[PDB]
Nucleic acid binder design. Sequence first.
DNA 1: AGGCGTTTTT
DNA 2: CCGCAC
Length: 750
Amino acid sequence: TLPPFLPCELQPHGLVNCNWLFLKSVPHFSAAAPRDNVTSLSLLSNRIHHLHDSDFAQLSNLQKLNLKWNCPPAGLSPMHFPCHMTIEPNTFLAVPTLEELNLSYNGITTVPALPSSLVSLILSRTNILQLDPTSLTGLHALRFLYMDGNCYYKNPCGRALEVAPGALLGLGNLTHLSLKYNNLTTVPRSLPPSLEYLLLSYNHIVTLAPEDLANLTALRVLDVGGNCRRCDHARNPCVECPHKFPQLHSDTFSHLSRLEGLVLKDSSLYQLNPRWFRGLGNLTVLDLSENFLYDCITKTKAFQGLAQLRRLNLSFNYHKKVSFAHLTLAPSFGSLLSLQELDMHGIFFRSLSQKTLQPLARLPMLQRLYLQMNFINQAQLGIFKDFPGLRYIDLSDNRISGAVESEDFMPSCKNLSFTLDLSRNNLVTVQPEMFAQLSRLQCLRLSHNSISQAVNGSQFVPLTSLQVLDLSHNKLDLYHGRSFTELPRLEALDLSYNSQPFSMRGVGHNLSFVAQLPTLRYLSLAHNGIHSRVSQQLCSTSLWALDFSGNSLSQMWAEGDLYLRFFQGLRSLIRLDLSQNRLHTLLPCTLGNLPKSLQLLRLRNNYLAFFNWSSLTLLPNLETLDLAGNQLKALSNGSLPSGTQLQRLDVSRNSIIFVVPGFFALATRLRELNLSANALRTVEPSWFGFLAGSLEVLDVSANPLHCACGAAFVDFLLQVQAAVPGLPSRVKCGSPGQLQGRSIFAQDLR
DNA sequence: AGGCGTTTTT
DNA sequence: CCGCAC
Ligand SMILES: *[C@@H]1O[C@H](CO)[C@@H](O[C@@H]2O[C@H](CO)[C@@H](O)[C@H](O)[C@H]2NC(C)=O)[C@H](O)[C@H]1NC(C)=O
Ligand SMILES: *[C@@H]1O[C@H](CO)[C@@H](O)[C@H](O)[C@H]1NC(C)=O
Ligand SMILES: *[C@@H]1O[C@H](CO)[C@@H](O)[C@H](O)[C@H]1NC(C)=O
Ligand SMILES: *[C@@H]1O[C@H](CO)[C@@H](O)[C@H](O)[C@H]1NC(C)=O
Ligand SMILES: *[C@@H]1O[C@H](CO)[C@@H](O)[C@H](O)[C@H]1NC(C)=O
Ligand SMILES: *[C@@H]1O[C@H](CO)[C@@H](O)[C@H](O)[C@H]1NC(C)=O
Ligand SMILES: *[C@@H]1O[C@H](CO)[C@@H](O)[C@H](O)[C@H]1NC(C)=O
Ligand SMILES: *[C@@H]1O[C@H](CO)[C@@H](O)[C@H](O)[C@H]1NC(C)=O
Ligand SMILES: *[C@@H]1O[C@H](CO)[C@@H](O)[C@H](O)[C@H]1NC(C)=O
């Protein structure tokens, strides 16, 4: 039986997904199909320029409708094609259940009439240039109104969006209003007193006063950032904040005593007025980024009163054309007792010392501290020792060079207690002295440095708690036998993209150190170009995962018996990646010399044209085999052998022409099978024995299927349509004639 | 005539 | 195969 909503896809929680099917108008569906069960209808990015009274009438319990991007204005059109969208008056009224509507990135100039059931309405990036009380008649349940970007550089209108005084007061439930990028020069008068979130960013409201926010006592979040911009920091087109602006009256925010978040970023602020923050005793988030407060953060008392503040963003508060020799934070910072998160990135200051952060040192909740992109070239890292609650320091993209004068394969540092990011700095060696006071560290990132050192066991001596060490994108020379043995708790070590030593033709390298790292569980040697003159064996009793991708086992395994047992000493290894190893061939003895313990083997993006499938019994525990991106011409040369434990098999992006009968039949555990992007002209139940109904996933997309009248595959795919992702739209015909490139369901074949 | 195309936010 | 110790 067919999929119930062609050409669209049924999904969980009653979602019918019609996205990206290039529809010229709204599909009505079959009258047999259960239009009652439909709670959400997605039509993202089709080309429906005309909506009608009948289009949603049969959908009697529709709660959500997304029609975004269907008829975008000239300015947001990839090729500046104009487009104006027509809506018959009862289009939406005929859906009295509708709660959420999205008409963004569509060419409409008036708001259509809408059912009183509506809770959320998104009109962003339209050409609606006015809102008067008649726009939103009888929407007494409406809580959300987003209408950003109806007049800006990418969707211009020649004037300002005019919202009439009092025009929204009819919306007594309204909590969220956003009117960004609308070329506004003043806040709309008399907005709903129910408002909790008022977002007015990237307009040109250069003046504010308490009259501009009258009766808005319910406000929890106000955003007025980007109204008076510093264009020296802009990535997009930008008009410079005029001379002697902006003007924010002292008491502007005083009646807003529920206010949790205030955003004043990119407002060209040279000085903070402590009266701006009087009365804001619920204030937990303050964004002051992209201002000119480099000098004001050394002196100001403006923070004194902010007992509840948790996140303070002071980033990109830099002085034009300069970095500072020194920076000393104001003593007032020391009263921010609730502070958890401080962003100081992009201020530009050359020295990080005891004096720089002294106020912050006894704040008991301070966990996250962002210090990146500051052109810092001296940094006493010992300053962080006695910070009571520190979990994360980002010191990346700085100029520090020393001490002062898939998580299957590589775990992240998120669940760990203390992480220092020193990546994208100028270290050429590692002096143990710079980490003397950081013995509590559990994760250290040192990637993208210039480390050209022959490490030997004496570089990281103090880091007695360190579990993860990322040294990717460096030039470590792996040669001495006791490198890293000084890190007693080391569990994960990333040595990827440290290729330059291994490119040194005629100079060999020694990986015997790996055997001396007794708790190492994860090791990456990826993208190192490892090809000749290296250790014959990797030995480790403890290792679980090894990313050996982007090397040339090809050249190693071509070189007599020298490297045939290369991975065999990894006695506990469960995951191995041998992808992009230029492998044109594999011996069955080479695969048998892999650890018996293996569960995941990747061989993606190699050049294998042949695979002796029987040799999979030499890996008893193998659950996942990835051969994507090879050149298999067929699934043949035996079948998947008896008793294999294989659950996942990916033979996508090969040149597979056919599959032998009974090929998967003996793979009793096989759940996911990817046959995508091959040259398969059919799909057959004969391939599976008669056990295809146990497959949870069967991807057969981008295959040049032969769409002939009464073809066997059509009936088959409907048998197991549960498991075929994208069946309604992305499984396509390669022949005959007219049908090439069109869906299998573009015409009924049965 | 309409087409374009997976488009975050700035 | 990179200051070892013919
Ligand atoms: C089956 O494999 C295909 C192709 O190898 C997957 O589709 C690709 O997905 C990746 C990321 O998931 C993208 O970078 C590619 O652009 C996609 N390519 C194509 C041609 O679609 C597909 O997602 C896999 N199937 C399953 C069920 O995971
Ligand atoms: C903003 O409004 C002014 C007129 O008040 C106009 O000159 C300018 O072009 C408008 N901006 C846009 C993007 O239309
Ligand atoms: C808000 O919506 C409710 C129903 O959810 C309705 O009682 C009323 O019209 C609105 N209430 C207020 C106080 O505005
Ligand atoms: C604030 O609310 C009252 C009505 O409750 C009204 O009289 C007053 O004009 C409002 N103020 C402004 C500035 O709109
Ligand atoms: C915080 O919020 C409540 C109302 O939501 C307000 O009445 C109270 O005065 C505020 N101030 C402080 C210091 O918590
Ligand atoms: C490592 O080489 C250094 C030179 O930086 C040398 O002083 C030291 O004795 C060697 N350390 C170990 C642990 O072998
Ligand atoms: C590699 O290092 C180990 C440990 O020092 C050593 O015993 C082995 O002989 C070295 N390999 C070569 C080729 O010298
Ligand atoms: C493998 O199968 C292909 C056909 O798919 C055939 O051409 C080839 O000779 C076979 N070789 C072996 C060794 O089974
Ligand atoms: C696979 O390898 C085994 C053992 O070397 C051999 O007996 C068998 O004939 C091979 N199969 C093919 C199709 O080459």
